[PDB]
Design an enzyme around this catalytic site. Structure first.
Site, PDB file in Angstrom:
ATOM      1  N   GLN A 168      -0.814 -10.111  11.378  1.00  0.00           N
ATOM      2  CA  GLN A 168       0.316  -9.608  10.798  1.00  0.00           C
ATOM      3  C   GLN A 168      -0.078  -8.356  10.494  1.00  0.00           C
ATOM      4  OE1 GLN A 168      -0.354  -7.384   8.335  1.00  0.00           O
ATOM      5  NE2 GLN A 168       2.144  -6.797   7.324  1.00  0.00           N
ATOM      6  N   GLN A 208       0.815  -0.933  -0.189  1.00  0.00           N
ATOM      7  CA  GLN A 208      -0.143   0.167  -0.034  1.00  0.00           C
ATOM      8  C   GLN A 208       1.298   1.121  -0.052  1.00  0.00           C
ATOM      9  OE1 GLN A 208      -4.113  -0.401   0.278  1.00  0.00           O
ATOM     10  NE2 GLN A 208      -3.775   1.614  -0.552  1.00  0.00           N
ATOM     11  N   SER A 222       3.840  -6.451   3.860  1.00  0.00           N
ATOM     12  CA  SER A 222       2.138  -6.263   4.007  1.00  0.00           C
ATOM     13  C   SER A 222       1.871  -6.795   3.068  1.00  0.00           C
ATOM     14  CB  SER A 222       2.019  -5.313   4.158  1.00  0.00           C
ATOM     15  OG  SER A 222       0.087  -4.794   4.946  1.00  0.00           O
ATOM     16  N   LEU A 223       0.715  -5.949   1.931  1.00  0.00           N
ATOM     17  CA  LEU A 223       0.302  -7.479   1.061  1.00  0.00           C
ATOM     18  C   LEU A 223       0.973  -8.038   0.530  1.00  0.00           C
ATOM     19  CD1 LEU A 223      -0.330  -6.503  -2.285  1.00  0.00           C
ATOM     20  CD2 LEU A 223      -2.158  -7.549  -0.950  1.00  0.00           C
ATOM     21  N   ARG A 275      -8.553  -9.079   2.536  1.00  0.00           N
ATOM     22  CA  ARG A 275      -8.109  -8.000   3.177  1.00  0.00           C
ATOM     23  C   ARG A 275      -8.799  -6.895   2.884  1.00  0.00           C
ATOM     24  NH1 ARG A 275      -2.077  -5.972   3.393  1.00  0.00           N
ATOM     25  NH2 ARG A 275      -1.379  -6.658   5.242  1.00  0.00           N
ATOM     26  N   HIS A 287      -1.427  -2.312  11.707  1.00  0.00           N
ATOM     27  CA  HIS A 287      -0.748  -2.622  12.428  1.00  0.00           C
ATOM     28  C   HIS A 287      -0.767  -1.961  13.599  1.00  0.00           C
ATOM     29  CE1 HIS A 287       0.282  -5.007   9.068  1.00  0.00           C
ATOM     30  NE2 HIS A 287      -0.382  -3.287   7.642  1.00  0.00           N
TER      31      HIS A 287
END
Length: 281
Positions: free
Chosen positions: A239, A9, A86-87, A111, A191
């Site tokens: 995560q 992202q 992340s992604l 997600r 997060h």
């Protein structure tokens, strides 16, 4: 040795992926089937202005990253290690054979939906302060509802939590030497503890999927160490509420003897982080 790094992202841009859709027309059509819209149109034209909204960004980045990987596999020797931000972890796990293209896309569709629908909190990207200084500033300024979301390089940290705290911390952070302090436009405090409800919901979804052992090692955002097959399902939900240990992941790879770090996907965001990690390491 060589590692491929998969961006997440914030790295997206209109025009991303343009050559890849025509090079992989079956996979592009299969993505459109999973998503219910043209992935080419989203990435090329962004006709509904939603490429910036994570429910759409996540699929766009996953597709561009996956096709970028397939093109690199056609053109160069295989990487020794994989890591995604992340992604980007989903892209890395696809590249490692943990799941197939369409399965990974289903997981990222979910997600993105869950993260885009979350609310509560905000985030700020900070340049110029190390982790321990950031921690000290949170403590000294009474920001008890702010977590560290990303450890990106020795001087690049993203904080995440209560919106009022994220706003007011700009002053003491700048007073300490933050060269840049950018409040992000995001649905929620990703997060951080604010994501616990979404984490539980994503975990319930992930129960329905199996994860094959990686055929190329993938470094986990949660542990900063190679993923173990039996732990992947749990880690993928944890995560979203946990710090992204990117800096440590790259340092671990350097310690393993990786000298070539190549970004696989659109842009040079991770490449910029690498340069800062290398200069300190």
């Amino acid at each position: 040795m060589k590692a491929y790094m998969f961006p997440g992202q914030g790295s997206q841009a209109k025009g991303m992926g343009r050559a890849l859709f025509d090079a992989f027309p079956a996979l592009t059509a299969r993505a459109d089937g999973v998503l219910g819209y043209s992935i080419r149109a989203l990435c090329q034209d962004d006709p509904d202005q939603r490429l910036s909204q994570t429910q759409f960004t996540q699929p766009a980045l996953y597709v561009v990253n996956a096709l970028s990987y397939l093109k690199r596999r056609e053109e160069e020797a295989p990487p020794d290690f994989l890591a995604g931000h992340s992604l980007g972890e989903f892209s890395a796990l696809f590249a490692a054979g943990v799941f197939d293209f369409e399965t990974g896309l289903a997981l990222v569709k979910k997600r993105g939906e869950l993260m885009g629908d979350a609310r509560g909190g905000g985030m700020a990207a900070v340049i110029g302060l190390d982790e321990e200084r950031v921690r000290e500033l949170l403590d000294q300024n009474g920001a008890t509802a702010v977590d560290i979301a990303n450890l990106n390089s020795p001087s690049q940290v993203v904080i995440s939590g209560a919106k009022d705290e994220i706003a007011r911390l700009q002053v003491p952070f700048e007073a300490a030497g933050a060269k840049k302090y950018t409040v992000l436009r995001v649905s929620a405090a990703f997060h951080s503890r604010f994501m616990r409800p979404a984490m539980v919901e994503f975990g319930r979804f992930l129960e329905g999927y199996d994860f094959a052992p990686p055929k190329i090692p993938v470094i986990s955002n949660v542990t900063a160490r190679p993923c173990k097959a039996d732990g992947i399902r749990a880690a993928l939900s944890e995560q979203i509420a946990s710090p992204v240990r990117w800096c440590e992941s790259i340092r671990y790879l350097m310690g393993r003897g990786v000298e070539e770090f190549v970004e696989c996907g659109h842009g040079i965001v991770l490449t910029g982080l690498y340069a800062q990690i290398r200069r300190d390491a």
